[model samples]
Target chain A: AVDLNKENRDPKYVESIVNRSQKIVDKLGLTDAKVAEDVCNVIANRYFELNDIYEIRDAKVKAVKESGLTGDAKNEALKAAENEKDAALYRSHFAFPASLSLFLNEEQIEAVKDGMTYGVVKVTYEATLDMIPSLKEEEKVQIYAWLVEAREFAMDAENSNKKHAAFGKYKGRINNYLAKRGYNLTKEREEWAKRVKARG
Target chain B: AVDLNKENRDPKYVESIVNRSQKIVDKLGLTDAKVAEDVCNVIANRYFELNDIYEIRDAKVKAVKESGLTGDAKNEALKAAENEKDAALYRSHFAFPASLSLFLNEEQIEAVKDGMTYGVVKVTYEATLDMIPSLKEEEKVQIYAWLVEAREFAMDAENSNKKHAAFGKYKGRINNYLAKRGYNLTKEREEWAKRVKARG
Candidate 1:
């Protein structure tokens, strides 16, 4: 729904944290091979667990998506989105280390990837949403609203990609993203293709 | 556009008032022949007569297409379109006798029919009225509003027919209504052809 760019990826926070992590690296420098390996193993075993980061990733998405409030709250969030400084802060807070980005936050990445798919997928969902009033009401609206919201949330997560440069555009990367999460994106797209119609 | 359902076909207006000629059809109460002969003579006499309608149509279309008013007006119009009465009025107003639909004021149906390959051809001029957001801003809004109105109109018309013991869906009558008054129904579809996607 909404995004907070800088606070989530605040470079200053990254700098401070990286500056701290660097001290440990410096202590276990490359000279002592065995200890370096031991230290690396200890650190990886401790922090590489994916479960620890799922909630954090989910929280980041929920915070922004649910952040829209009436009046000043909405204005404040829009301002944060439009503000470069805040966006930068957000970038760092949410940025993953180059090494740990993949294995650790896999679920989060999947969610983000889901959101990415939604950048296109949501067009149809939203179009359907736009057409909702035309359909029979009550339970149908409830079901459609829930589905649309879930898709929208997933889309927002994908657009919030902070680690990779291009989010790896290409069928190959997309296939990888979908496969890792047990999703067949091509099949989903094909299904949608049958439903869409454009008028001139 | 405002509907002139009775104006063109009114024998009193075409023959008595404008042409000052005799009635062409006595029993069936048709106006086509007399109106055609009168307008043909006028066209032979004054070449500039049709230009006036063209100018009006062009100006109206331009204003509706480019002006953003159409969008707003259409939105406002649709707000009330949920009501069956308003919508029915809008739809019925659009229907007219096929032969006399176009240039009804000038009585030029036969001329148009002779010019086109299909004797039963239906012609509708689509302006940015429903798409343009610049000229007449209310154009699109009016269209959307009218759609609600038109849908309501269709429902009522269908019910009225149903009340008279007519069977087999009334969608055909709806198409006929659209066709006779000038509409591009080349892509007109049967209700049975609609699948889940089209319904969605």
Candidate 2:
């Protein structure tokens, strides 16, 4: 696509996203040169689209702050910008996978999702299981299910910090559910830390 | 798959769903008989799962009525049943496509979706374009985008009637969008009717 060549793009940002996307494609085991490149570009373009949405929000915030508006007026304006960004994300949400569906199956799509969101879904779910091995079958299902749900939100987050924050929110929810179910998370975590170090 | 042979299922009902699913799989151009059978079973199992969830909701509503709960209690009970069904849908949603990824590519999965939903997306989209031949490129993009979004929900609907209802809701949204965009829909439809008749 020579997506990096667009006049409106930061070539460096484009390169970084494409490079990151390439790493995902590498793991996908795509052998065809053209298909791999196409998938990478599709992933990179989604990053660009997400940035464009956030940039619009940022620009709106900057405009409102400079406009001499105050009190509720300023607050409403900032909130409206965030709302618009959210709306844009919702509208643009389905199209990304629709675009990728041309070349990738659902599993590869999931792989790309994990790549974008730092694979936090698997990491956190596995960590929880390792920490509390005696969790009931239903408990295990609920924990993994919630983590996958959180991954959906994390995948849409604007930046790395926000992505982690999305998963972080769900982690708390899981911990609360565990505590409610009579799990001693503090002790579990302490023992899990010991097990990790022992493995190393 | 002998998907219709489950002890818990009504043989007649299971047969109908499996028959429908088989028709969809057939058009996927699957060459391997085993893969084709697997896809059909996966699709049928989804239908069965959806029925199972709704049957639970129905049973709840029946029990609530039988218990003589009145006013807010009965209302809340009914609403809670619906809410649980929604929660079940949300949790089970990921696993369906995840299951499909093992056998079908995204395109075939979409084909299965269209098969389930009666191809309303393509029919409505193409009909809109035919009726409003002068739609701007961006307007066309929005129309198709909204249809695809509607398909996602339609794919989740429990039965054929509800699936059509899902598309019907989106059609109204599109109609409203077109009206707001200053299209003379009445005139467009009149012309479209003539064109269809003339072709006939």
Candidate 3:
């Protein structure tokens, strides 16, 4: 990662992202190193562009907070921040995946997705099911669906905390779903323990 | 679960836990119904005994809160509750495992342990690894070791929140380990995202 204090998207910074991305592709044993390296560099460039968008937005936010401008002027400045951030998100949300699809199959794309978020979404969803073995088939489907949705958004998050937060939101939804399903999670958990003990 | 409002170890209450435990044994499809029934009954009885210990501790805590005693007297009351809790945990901890060993193998014992803690330890450990793929082998081993230790305490936790809290303590340790390894996790995470994108 480039120093936070330094220019965030210079050639050297972009080079670093590309190099790191190349390592991930190499780890996955994907496209020939040369082919993957080219694709990864493009992807890295897009990431740098996305970061620049966010940096501009962040600067706008700081400027807005300090400016004495009031009313519509202040509102406009804040709106500009949101617009820039959203623009970055929109490009990232689609461009990265779309480019990956040009060269990868579904499973390979998943590898890329997992690589981005460190596969926490998969682990989390599976753990949720394990924690509640009695969830109905349809309920399980719904849970997985939301988690996948979370992963899509999480994949574009600027940082790991944001990535995990994306999943956290879906987890809250799943928890609420269970609460509404007449499941007493606490009691169910105890029941699970008893069952385990019985297995022994 | 038997109603907490009901007598902790009355015949009907004991019957409920035993029935629940037996169902778990049935689910495992490990032992014959007749033999498993007897084994499950003993397991249920131990669960009840463990519950009784906790109930006593809860009562002592309530008693201390209402007692007119102050200063040293109050502290002593609190200490007594701690002692009672620890005694029950010690007894239940060893007795439960020792009894399970008589009827089941090591894997079966693990199943029982997982059931007790809703398998959060495994989920949490895996999630941690996924969130940080670059951890050294030694670091990974330490994280797993701590998580397993957490499960030991989590199994005896009185409720779901406490069980999660038991694991939470270990998670803090793992996070600190990562921080100390010269990783600015959030930034490293962002860098990881860029790399994954590049893999495209």
Candidate 4:
């Protein structure tokens, strides 16, 4: 948090975001120096993950258009995009390079895993189970389920490179689903439309 | 889950929140069991904690109507309220009926705690956090920090409780400042207006 306000950019934007970030920290009552480091790590990891994700998504879009196809070809293009998206996702989960990335190896994946698991365990304990949603009496619990599955899947694949393959298999279906629907799939609308079609 | 609609009682209200809840859930593709529980726990715990907190601002209004208070009786009342609020906070942290409560002959407390914790933990991990916040990078970082602190706190009650007391002491000072200012405080605005302003 070294400030260079005198550098003469639109001053407020940087200040506001920084202030907002500090506000969030204060609201959480977080004062620990380690919490600051953890926050930095989270932010850095997030920036990389998100930026890499955008690159992946953008690459997918490009791949689809580069084919110069139509109809089912276009659909297939979209599908390719979808697959890329999933690959991006898969990579996201496993690609936690060390801060010393140019200087280090892929062991950074372990750091990412360690950080995320640490986050999960803490959120569960401090936030309280009542504070949790899946712990509620409701069915169809999703978030917790996905995280666990991802970790377990990763663990299963840890002994071999085959874990990558395992994720790829699932990625195919997800890609298809995304390609077919993109952002238009509302849960109710999709279900209702399907129901009506079934009756037809 | 069983779809047991009760009566003509504006199932609309329930419908709205339920639909919203489901929409939010589905939008994020949160189907995980554990993540859902954890997320739910966070949400529920936050709701309860916010609910339990009270402000002395209302009491200030009440005090304005009474002329004969025996020597800082109002202050004493505020102190008592603060203590009650603190207890409520601690209760929110552990909640009642949790597995841990069983150790203290507080089985009911343990049971409630268990249920609440289960709900919160399950929901969060499942998909609540993923969908609701859309899982931004900085946001994830912020949450990670909180999780870290919570874990440390849970590991050592003596340390955690001491920290808790420290927080409470500062909090009481803040409340006292507000009362002195003749500003009625609510649970909602305790952090606003800098009741306990510091000299920089």
**Interface DockQ per candidate:** 0.01, 0.05, 0.01, 0.01
Candidate 1 C-alpha lDDT tens digits along B1-200: 22222333445544432332112212223467754554344322221222233344346555555666667775433332222222222222212222234224323433322221121111111322222213233233323333322232232222334322221222344345455645545533332235324767
Q: Note each model's CA RMSD in angstroms.
A: 28.4, 12.2, 25.3, 25.9
Per-residue lDDT of A98 in model 3: 45
Chain A TM-score vs. truth, each candidate: 0.20, 0.91, 0.80, 0.36
TM-scores of the candidates are: 0.14, 0.56, 0.44, 0.24
lDDT of 1 at A180: 66
DockQ of 2: 0.05
**What's the residue-level lDDT of B189 in candidate 3?**
72
Q: Kindly give the stretch of ten consecutive residues in candidate 2 chain B with the minimal lDDT sum.
A: B1-10
- lDDT for predicted candidate 1 compared with the true structure: 0.34
Model number with the top DockQ: 2
For all candidates, what are the clash counts?
48, 0, 2, 78
lDDT of 3 by residue, A65-142 (tens): 898989998886686466456545642443455455545556777787777777887798778776788789867766
lDDT of 4 by residue, B18-66 (tens): 4433433233344665544343333333433333243333354366447
lDDT per residue for candidate 1 within A1-200, as digits (tens), equals: 11112244456744543443334444433475554443343332222222133444456545766875767766544443333222222222222232223222444333333333434434544554444323334323333333333332232222335312222232244345335656555665555565555421
Interface RMSD score of each model: 23.7, 8.9, 25.5, 20.3
Deviating ranges (above 4 Å) for candidate 1? A1-200, B1-40, B43-51, B68-70, B74-118, B121-200
Which rank order by TM-score, best down to worst? 2, 3, 4, 1
lDDT of 4 by residue, A94-124 (tens): 2233222322223443344434333342243
The lDDT for every candidate, in the order shown, is 0.34, 0.80, 0.68, 0.39
Give per-residue CA lDDT, model 3, range B1-200, as digits (tens). 11223353478766777676666566556745555655565566666766777888889888898989899989866765665566456434544554555456668777777766777877987776666777787677667667766777777777779888878887898789789888788977787778678877
Off by over 4 Å in 2: A1-116, A119-150, A153-200, B1-5, B197-200
Lowest-scoring 10 consecutive residues by lDDT in candidate 3 chain A? A1-10
